[PDB]
Amino acid sequence: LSRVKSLKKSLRQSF
Amino acid sequence: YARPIIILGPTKDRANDDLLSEFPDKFGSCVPHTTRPKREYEIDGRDYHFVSSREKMEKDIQAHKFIEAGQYNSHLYGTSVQSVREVAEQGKHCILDVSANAVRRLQAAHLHPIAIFIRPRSLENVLEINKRITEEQARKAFDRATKLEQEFTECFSAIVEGDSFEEIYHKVKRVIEDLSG
Secondary structure (H helix, E strand, O other), X not given: OXXXXXXXXXXXXXX | OOOOEEEEOOOHXXXXXXXXXXXXXXXXXXXXXEOOOOOOOOOEOOOEEEOOOHHHHHHHHHOOOEEEEEEEOOEEEEEEHHHHHHHHOOOOEEXXXXXXXXXXXXXXXXXXXXXXXXXXXXXXXXXXXXOOOOHHHHHHHHHHHHHHHHHHHHHOOEEEOOOOHHHHXXXXXXXXXXXXX
C-alpha cells in the first residue's frame, strides 16, 4: 500500500 | 439487474482487483463523485462525476444520496447510490470498495448488495492468506476483522474462510454465482 488512489484514501476520513 | 458486491475482511482488495481483471464482462466499477477540480485526461462521467459546488455535495450526503462519502486533501469524494444503480442496470456486478456501513445503505436503496465477509480463522491464518505482511500487522488485521464481525454479522450475505487466498477467491466466486439467481 504505497501510492494509494485518492478515492481509496478518502475512505480513511468517512462521514 | 446484477447485484452489487461488497467484499470485507483481510484480502478483500486483492479479491476485488482479481474479479475485475479476470471477468471484465461480469464485474465493473461505478463512477465516483468528487469536488476536486478536473485534471488533464480526466473525463466527467467516466473518471468522476465532478461536482462544482461543495455545498451541493454536502447537501446530497445529508440526503442519503451516497452509500460511502469521505474527504481527502481538502476535497470531498463519494460513491453515489445512482452510480451503483447505473452499473447494476447494465447487467454487471458492481465491485464496491466501501465500508460495511455501505451495505445497509444499499439495502435501504433497494439495490440488494451481496455482502461477503472473509473471516480469518486466527492470527496464524492471516499470515497464510496474506503473504505481504508482518506478524504484528497481521495482529492488527485480525483485531479489525474480529470487530467487523462482531458489529456487522447481520449484514453479511455469506462468510468465507480458507487456508490460502486461492481457496478464499474460489469460494468468493462460488458465493456470487449462487446469489446471482
